[PDB]
Amino acid sequence: LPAPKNLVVSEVTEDSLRLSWTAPDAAFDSFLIQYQESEKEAINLTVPGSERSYDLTGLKPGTEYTVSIYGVKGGHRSNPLSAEFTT
Amino acid sequence: LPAPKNLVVSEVTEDSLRLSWTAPDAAFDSFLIQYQESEKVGEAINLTVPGSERSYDLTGLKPGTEYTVSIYGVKGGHRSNPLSAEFTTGG
């Protein structure tokens, strides 16, 4: 399997967006933040269990997204903290 | 296991950073993007984007800080070699 090539990182101007949540201390090893454009290709990211927020970008203007936040201990995901927002 | 609570989404104004790359057509199911501070441990952010994507945008990073990225191509249940690089945030 050929590795990806030509990695480039550069500044870009767009709207940023933050998600906040509450959770018991030392309860989860990590948090699964699975978001996707409503009725569309989903993005699954994983932050450390000590985090209580994460910021998003690269979202299409004038549409709707759906976000589910899971509490993960080991590999066991808790119940989804779900929501939907308009960009 | 209890679910996290009080999900509030607010608008924030800050620097947005884009990662770009190239890959053969329909060669991978997804791409594993993994980044963390250079001198930090146990706080790496691993994310997964569809295998058709050739770009991903980032925010909420600490200004004036060097991070490290590694992007693997994912086909089936296996990954390719990493595409690693370093970068310093502005501010």
Side-chain angles (χ1 to χ4, degrees), chain A residues 1-38 41-87, chain B residues 1-38 41-91:
Chain A
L1 269 54
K5 303 180 305 178
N6 304 326
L7 175 52
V8 23
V9 24
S10 63
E11 196 84 346
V12 59
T13 300
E14 58 199 326
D15 299 85
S16 306
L17 176 140
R18 179 171 306 178
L19 310 175
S20 307
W21 67 87
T22 65
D25 298 35
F28 304 119
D29 290 314
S30 60
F31 293 102
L32 214 186
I33 307 183
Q34 171 187 297
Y35 70 97
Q36 184 185 3
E37 189 176 7
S38 295
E41 304 175 2
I43 294 183
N44 297 32
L45 64 98
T46 296
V47 299
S50 56
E51 294 298 325
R52 289 302 179 271
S53 65
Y54 188 81
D55 304 16
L56 265 63
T57 18
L59 301 182
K60 292 180 54 183
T63 28
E64 182 187 9
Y65 290 82
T66 301
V67 182
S68 294
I69 307 181
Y70 302 90
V72 178
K73 192 60 178 182
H76 319 80
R77 41 209 282 177
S78 74
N79 290 268
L81 177 57
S82 300
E84 24 268 331
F85 65 96
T86 289
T87 55
Chain B
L1 277 67
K5 308 173 305 175
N6 308 316
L7 176 49
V8 43
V9 38
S10 62
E11 195 85 328
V12 179
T13 296
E14 56 191 6
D15 294 326
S16 301
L17 195 59
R18 171 174 298 184
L19 307 186
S20 305
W21 62 91
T22 61
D25 184 272
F28 304 105
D29 296 321
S30 63
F31 289 102
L32 212 205
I33 301 182
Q34 168 182 335
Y35 68 95
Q36 194 185 189
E37 301 193 41
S38 301
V41 284
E43 292 178 341
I45 299 183
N46 309 24
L47 70 108
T48 298
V49 293
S52 60
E53 305 296 285
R54 295 299 179 276
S55 175
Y56 185 75
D57 301 2
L58 286 74
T59 34
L61 300 184
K62 293 162 54 182
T65 308
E66 184 189 26
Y67 291 86
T68 304
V69 241
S70 295
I71 162 184
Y72 312 80
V74 185
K75 183 60 179 180
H78 305 286
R79 63 173 68 172
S80 64
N81 289 126
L83 174 56
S84 303
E86 318 281 320
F87 69 91
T88 300
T89 53

